[PDB]
Amino acid sequence: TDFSKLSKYVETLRVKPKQSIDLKKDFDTDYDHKMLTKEEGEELLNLGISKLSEIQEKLYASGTKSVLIVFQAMDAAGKDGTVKHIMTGLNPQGVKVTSFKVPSKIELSHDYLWRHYVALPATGEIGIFNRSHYENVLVTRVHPEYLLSEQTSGVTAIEQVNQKFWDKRFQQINNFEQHISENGTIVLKFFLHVSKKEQKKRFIERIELDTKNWKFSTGDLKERAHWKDYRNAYEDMLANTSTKQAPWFVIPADDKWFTRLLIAEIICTELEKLNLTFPTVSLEQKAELEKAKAELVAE
Numbered sequence: 001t002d003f004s005k006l007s008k009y010v011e012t013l014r015v016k017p018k019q020s021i022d023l024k025k026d027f028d029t030d031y032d033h034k035m036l037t038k039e040e041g042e043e044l045l046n047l048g049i050s051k052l053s054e055i056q057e058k059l060y061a062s063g064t065k066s067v068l069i070v071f072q073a074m075d076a077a078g079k080d081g082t083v084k085h086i087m088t089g090l091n092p093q094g095v096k097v098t099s100f101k102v103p104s105k106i107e108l109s110h111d112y113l114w115r116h117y118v119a120l121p122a123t124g125e126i127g128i129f130n131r132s133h134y135e136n137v138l139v140t141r142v143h144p145e146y147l148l149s150e151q152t153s154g155v156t157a158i159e160q161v162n163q164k165f166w167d168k169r170f171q172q173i174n175n176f177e178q179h180i181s182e183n184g185t186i187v188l189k190f191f192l193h194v195s196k197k198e199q200k201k202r203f204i205e206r207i208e209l210d211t212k213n214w215k216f217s218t219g220d221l222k223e224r225a226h227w228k229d230y231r232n233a234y235e236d237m238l239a240n241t242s243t244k245q246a247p248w249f250v251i252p253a254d255d256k257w258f259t260r261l262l263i264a265e266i267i268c269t270e271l272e273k274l275n276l277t278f279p280t281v282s283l284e285q286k287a288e289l290e291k292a293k294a295e296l297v298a299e
């Protein structure tokens, strides 16, 4: 069955703990051997959103768990659109998106995890980090001068930054994710993997659409010039922070409907392992219900 074929492909996207990573070679930005049509993918994606909605309702109602979903990607990979698609299927009461911008002055007076810790989901809730704590081994690794504005980083000069520094943040991040995973949080992390070619095509398409044009600010393409350093930082990150307990998935991003299908599928699969059910109505509660109803009929 197609779904079964989809389910098998999905497992190839999970980053194994003791695996090495080459994003050019070991992971696709688009997939040729798609086991379904686009119109089928849209159908299935819609079933996924409804299932996720049922899960969210059960989670809010009864569950002893929280859920944290992380999105990282290069610009124009489809990250915001994906977040938005997932989100509008869900109850706003139980879901919270946090897009972490450049740190505030206050946030810069705490360690780099603090603001992420502060924003964690409460039990019964779903938190989505659109960008995350991982920016601290990505954008700040490509742009290590940013560490000089970090009063907690202990970096007065970029020569001080080396591989041990990054290893040490990887260990911090893992410890953090392990702690929350051992205290009720399900952690799931998605890297939307767009090709340099497709990013260009999307950038040009945005530049030529007058409806979207006004959102461009000076230097929005700067990160594309550091494509290779980002690739490197992503590779090293993915090889050292995917655990069985807090896995990374590398999602091909060059076809958006498919990217969305995959993420919805993985989230459903993973949260289905919690065996969430609605509360059931005991005899005592049943009695109360029938008593309440009799009072209304008798007014």
Ligand SMILES: O=P(O)(O)C(Nc1ccc(Cc2ccccc2)cc1)P(=O)(O)O
Pocket: 076, 078, 080, 081, 202, 203, 206, 207, 212, 213, 215, 216, 217, 220, 221
């Ligand atoms: O989903 P939408 O909101 O319609 C699009 N978002 C978007 C974000 C930033 C910009 C400014 C910009 C950035 C780089 C190159 C040229 C222009 C334009 C549009 P999209 O994510 O679908 O592209």
